[PDB]
């Protein structure tokens, strides 16, 4: 009862990821609704009205401007450009305080896995600074094939702090 969907994976409606280009025509629509974008979340880059709405909501003003933008048959994207949406603090910007955040620079998934696989034990010293500094040792990565797995192992390894992979 095996399927095609493992050797020839065919799907529908996947939004191609958009990257900030050097191109002249990477235009911007600046909005004034703090509903989805923060001061830190100063902008966001789009290539399809569908994704625009699926992030903002098809009922949003920004959505409607996105439609009117995307309907011009010569579309800026047709010339290798992107749409962006910015944000300027129209109203009282409330910013809920977040937790301390730690990020790895090394985006490379491939290089990390073998090193973790070889190492049987582990050792690990974080400080939530909420009291006793952590002393974390019992780390095994032998059964890991993906970054999510080492992430979850770390989660179970650090108290009071959730870890994840993005």
């Amino acid at each position: 009862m095996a399927s095609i969907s493992e050797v020839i994976r065919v799907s529908l409606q996947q939004e191609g990821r958009a990257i900030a280009p050097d191109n002249m025509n990477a235009v911007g629509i600046i909005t004034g609704n703090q509903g989805v974008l923060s001061t830190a979340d100063r902008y966001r880059i789009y290539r399809t009205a569908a994704a625009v709405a699926s992030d903002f909501g098809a009922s949003s003003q920004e959505s409607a401007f996105a439609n009117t933008f995307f309907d011009t048959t010569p579309n800026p994207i047709s010339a290798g450009g992107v749409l962006v949406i910015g944000y300027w603090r129209s109203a009282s910007e409330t910013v809920a305080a977040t937790s301390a955040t730690l990020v790895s620079e090394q985006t490379s998934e491939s290089v990390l896995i073998p090193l973790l696989n070889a190492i049987n034990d582990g050792s690990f010293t974080i400080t939530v600074d909420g009291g006793t500094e952590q002393e974390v040792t019992a780390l095994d990565f032998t059964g890991v094939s993906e970054l999510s797995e080492v992430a979850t192992i770390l989660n179970s390894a650090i108290t009071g702090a959730t870890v994840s992979e993005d």
Binding site: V7, P114, N117, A118, N120, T142, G143, V144, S145
Partner: protein, 166 residues
Amino acid sequence: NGYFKVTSSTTGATSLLSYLGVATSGTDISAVLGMNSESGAVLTQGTDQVVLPAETKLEGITAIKSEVNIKGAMFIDQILDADIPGIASFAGANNMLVYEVFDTGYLSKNVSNPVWAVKLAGQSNFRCLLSKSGNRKFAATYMARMHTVLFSGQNTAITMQLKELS
């Protein structure tokens, strides 16, 4: 096949030492026969009695490559797990492939699972195969499908994704 075999009727601890020598009573055939003492000739002296070599291990495959220079090997039996790393290392060192199958029990990312051990060890010459039935014959049609390549034609390097097997 061009070889002249001379074997005494008696078996066990009976020696045909002589390399046909020379008789003073006639014109020799020994020299022209090519079985003189100077002439190269294999003379396996009769063994003492029946011999009972102890049961070797599948590691005794060392002997086979010692005499044939094969490149793709099998085993009728299933290779027991404790021998798996040994035969894998042998494959890596003696520069050949070894195809092996496993039932669904070995389907894990666990170290205790020998195949995942092979993966984490980089023993890439020890190819691991799956058969819910444990169909050892599946190795054969596998070995018989990979190795069909001439290495002198224009384009002959084949993968094995989706190849007809028997």
